[PDB]
Amino acid sequence: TLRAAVFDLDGVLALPAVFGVLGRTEEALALPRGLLNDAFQKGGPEGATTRLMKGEITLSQWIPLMEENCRKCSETAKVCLPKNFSIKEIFDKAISARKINRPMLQAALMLRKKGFTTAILTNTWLDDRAERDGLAQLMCELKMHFDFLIESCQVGMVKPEPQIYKFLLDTLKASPSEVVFLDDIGANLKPARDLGMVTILVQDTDTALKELEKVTGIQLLNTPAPLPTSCNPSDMSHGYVTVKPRVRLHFVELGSGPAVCLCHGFPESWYSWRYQIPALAQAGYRVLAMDMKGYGESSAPPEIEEYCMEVLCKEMVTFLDKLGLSQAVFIGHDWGGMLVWYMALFYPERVRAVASLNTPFIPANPNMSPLESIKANPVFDYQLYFQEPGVAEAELEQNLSRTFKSLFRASDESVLSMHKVCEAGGLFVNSPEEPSLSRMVTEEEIQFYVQQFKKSGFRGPLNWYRNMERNWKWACKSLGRKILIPALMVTAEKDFVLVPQMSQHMEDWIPHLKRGHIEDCGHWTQMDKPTEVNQILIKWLDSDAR
Amino acid sequence: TLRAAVFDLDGVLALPAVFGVLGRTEEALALPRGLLNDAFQKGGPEGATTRLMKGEITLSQWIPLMEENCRKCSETAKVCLPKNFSIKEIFDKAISARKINRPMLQAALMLRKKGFTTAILTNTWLDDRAERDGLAQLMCELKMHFDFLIESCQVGMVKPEPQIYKFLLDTLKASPSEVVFLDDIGANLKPARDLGMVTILVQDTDTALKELEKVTGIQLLNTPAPLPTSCNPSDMSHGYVTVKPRVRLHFVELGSGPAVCLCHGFPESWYSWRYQIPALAQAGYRVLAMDMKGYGESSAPPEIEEYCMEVLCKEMVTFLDKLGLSQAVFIGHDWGGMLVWYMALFYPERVRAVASLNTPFIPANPNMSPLESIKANPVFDYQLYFQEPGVAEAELEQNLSRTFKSLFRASDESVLSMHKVCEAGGLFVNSPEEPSLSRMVTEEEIQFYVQQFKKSGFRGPLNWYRNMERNWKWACKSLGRKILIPALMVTAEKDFVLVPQMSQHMEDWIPHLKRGHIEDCGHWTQMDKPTEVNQILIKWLDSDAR
Numbered sequence A, B: 001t002l003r004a005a006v007f008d009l010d011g012v013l014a015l016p017a018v019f020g021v022l023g024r025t026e027e028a029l030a031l032p033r034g035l036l037n038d039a040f041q042k043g044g045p046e047g048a049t050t051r052l053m054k055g056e057i058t059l060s061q062w063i064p065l066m067e068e069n070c071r072k073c074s075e076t077a078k079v080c081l082p083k084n085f086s087i088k089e090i091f092d093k094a095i096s097a098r099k100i101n102r103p104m105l106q107a108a109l110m111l112r113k114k115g116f117t118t119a120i121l122t123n124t125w126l127d128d129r130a131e132r133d134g135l136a137q138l139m140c141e142l143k144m145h146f147d148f149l150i151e152s153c154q155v156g157m158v159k160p161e162p163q164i165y166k167f168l169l170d171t172l173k174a175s176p177s178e179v180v181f182l183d184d185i186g187a188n189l190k191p192a193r194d195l196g197m198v199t200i201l202v203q204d205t206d207t208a209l210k211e212l213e214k215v216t217g218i219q220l221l222n223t224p225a226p227l228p229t230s231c232n233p234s235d236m237s238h239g240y241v242t243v244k245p246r247v248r249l250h251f252v253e254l255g256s257g258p259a260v261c262l263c264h265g266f267p268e269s270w271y272s273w274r275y276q277i278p279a280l281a282q283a284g285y286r287v288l289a290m291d292m293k294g295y296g297e298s299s300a301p302p303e304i305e306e307y308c309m310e311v312l313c314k315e316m317v318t319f320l321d322k323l324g325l326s327q328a329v330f331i332g333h334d335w336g337g338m339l340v341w342y343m344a345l346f347y348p349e350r351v352r353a354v355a356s357l358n359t360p361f362i363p364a365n366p367n368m369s370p371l372e373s374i375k376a377n378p379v380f381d382y383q384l385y386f387q388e389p390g391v392a393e394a395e396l397e398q399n400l401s402r403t404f405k406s407l408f409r410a411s412d413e414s415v416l417s418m419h420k421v422c423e424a425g426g427l428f429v430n431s432p433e434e435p436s437l438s439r440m441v442t443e444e445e446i447q448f449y450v451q452q453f454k455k456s457g458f459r460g461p462l463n464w465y466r467n468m469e470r471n472w473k474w475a476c477k478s479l480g481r482k483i484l485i486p487a488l489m490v491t492a493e494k495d496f497v498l499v500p501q502m503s504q505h506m507e508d509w510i511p512h513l514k515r516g517h518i519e520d521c522g523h524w525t526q527m528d529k530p531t532e533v534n535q536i537l538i539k540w541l542d543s544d545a546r
């Protein structure tokens, strides 16, 4: 029966409320009780505050009208306002102190995933203060989680006028009895109640959530921690840059601040960073998540030598040049992590900082060919299977749904053994034809990868493995160098191929290397433990890349 | 006969040279003459500096080897180095002091436009210092003006080894007698001379340029000021964002720093900002030059009401939301300038600062319909001609080459009279069928606009003029507001329609408005006086938007 939930901003989704700060200001300045709240409401429907909430005047135009109201009120109360009394200073601190009420936002997100239409209906103003960016940032964070945002100053109506409630019902396409309305001001609930809406008076968050659980029948309060917010491909800004006549790179972009370039591995997509992109943008970075060469919407030339590290790194430098970026932080995973270590070794002036997930920095051995080293370790035997052009492509392209469902699994759900791949004559020889869906991915997420690989196939991606001698010869030029720019190595306890032990001598080459370690995490780090990855990257970026 | 010019970086394209700073450091610290230059070259081909220039070691690995060399040299000279002696400190200041030698860069640009292949051949290092960004920025600025950049540390060879000269000739595809080689180090010219190349020893810039003019036959020294660097559409990063199911906005992006959104007018393109985009990016801004709705690669729905200001402004806010930008500086020209004033009036929290080229802020009159005001001024008569759907489209789409050649002209080259357009029954009634090319545009630039308008035509663009009453009704809501965020109004002396006098009462609405004025400038401000626009915008951005 209930299918829509409406929340107020001030005092409900953001705490503390402005009215609460006015009461504390009166106590701190030993002013008569309610003086600032009376000046704020002076004139009712014809007063300055109603004109502000309706968008007739801006916040900066209202500030001197509110100060005049404070003086008129203090005069009738027979009191004097302190010498340094400033409405602007009081409001600046009140707005600045306001943070998202995480448990209330989590309840709204939970209701939305269960099919509820969610909205914010708020009495707010046109903020033209020099510090208005703080409010714009708060609104942008909240906005993305709600179906509708209705602000009084944009529609010319305020709560508790009954027409704003009729406007809300028309916008939601719902009858009053299907709506739950949460507000901390009792007067603002009365019109919603007259129409027949379920109302909840918000004094403390926990009691309001208990009422909300009771009326919706959905558990909201003691629920497990949700996954980080993920990307909707259709809502991203897609960028395209031609780095060479036949090569165009696609990326998705979000945020402002220092540039952070994310480099996925095999056989992945920019979409493998879906849980990191909003978190890193919200932390104050401009995120560029690439489709590496050979993948998704980036060019995929068939030639093997187009995928050697020297060419790939040169194109990443050109990518920065064409975007006008003198530097970027480079973060890679798997094949992308291999590339980011070589970007730091050959172009340190373009790399602000470097981080690798799972992939260690492995220096070339000038006495041993990489093909000889492959045979010495049965862990990397499967790479010999990837050498012959056409062989692994036919197996991997045969059934795309099976390829991604078999690969994208948690460490305890594995259906593949990377040893004896050449002996068996394939990667999926003793693997089921229809594997179960892993717990880390949904069918919808799998189908995104399937659609992306339907375009250029596996030739481009597999060609990254077919330049072993070319890469070895190139890497040998850097054997006298050290990596002396900020660097982070993140190991994954349960990675089958890139084991944490392979990273143990990295300090010899990167003396001030920082480390992160994720327990119970397999190869697909980003989607296996997204919350842990986000925390590790954000803390490192804030200390070593800012 | 000569068709390639090669320049060194240090001491030729960038001044002062490092070797010059070593000599000044010796004089300032009262060290024996040549001590630092001897330590720098200690060991010759097997020394630390050659290993640095070949890319074997990085700059940070070389610093302690150079300090050890300084001590070995001071010991044989029987002198003591001062207590605070630091090679890192000396090199940091030397690199920091180095600026582009503008007259030398201007000569290279002039040779390139006359058909010369240009290259930089330099002995340089892998810079991994914490301050390496300064060098990366210098290299990016220079890079874009040259066909090739050959760095010693990337190719493993140094000047004066003869194989780096053979490598250069192979890269240029030229024989030695077709090459002019400029360098400030005499020893580095000897191998080029042995091969038969024309060499110029650079001591002072003016004398080197006189030698270069004599040998090339091209005037380089007393030439007029060149136009700012312009965009090549194929080299830009193209971005696409879906703001609504049927509406996708295209933009080009360049640079890092605070976001600056450029909004073109009618009937233009993102390409109208071609001279501002590189200048604003080089000044430290992230430029987003839009294709406004109805234009180029942005969506162009046929419905009139899709182009009213309320809808357009709402979509620009969504554009910022999808990119993760809490704020942007908005700069508009013509119809774009109209939009940016309304962005500041309705969404001040999303607008960091606002600037308009030519378009004044004109408040709505609540007593007079905009269609009545149009008839009172014969200057705006042509807007009545744009009202009837289909009429102006057929005339403007008839011959696209004629439409753009007739419109894009300097104030003294006009072939159109905007008065009596309705009386004549068309905009081009007494206009030539094949007008001459204006001096502000080339045929190639005209053809870009022709190709862009071949896609969606003039319906979308003309629909911006067909929402007069809808826009008037919407603007009436803001009559009690003032614009109190940083604002710049730039007038153009010779604009036929948007005359500077129409902006004179703007201070009543924007009390702290800043102004710019461009003399002898017509309607097409950006391409008419690009250098003047750039200077005005950059100075304003650096003081009011940073």
Ligand SMILES: OCCSc1nc2ccccc2[nH]1
Binding pocket: A266, A267, A334, A335, A338, A359, A407, A497
């Ligand atoms: O360090 C290079 C990538 S190692 C590697 N990553 C893989 C992911 C999936 C299957 C085989 C793989 N082999």
Ligand SMILES: OCCSc1nc2ccccc2[nH]1
Binding pocket: B266, B267, B334, B335, B338, B359, B407, B497
């Ligand atoms: O302020 C709205 C645009 S005024 C206007 N700009 C034009 C450019 C070209 C032709 C007619 C024009 N009319």
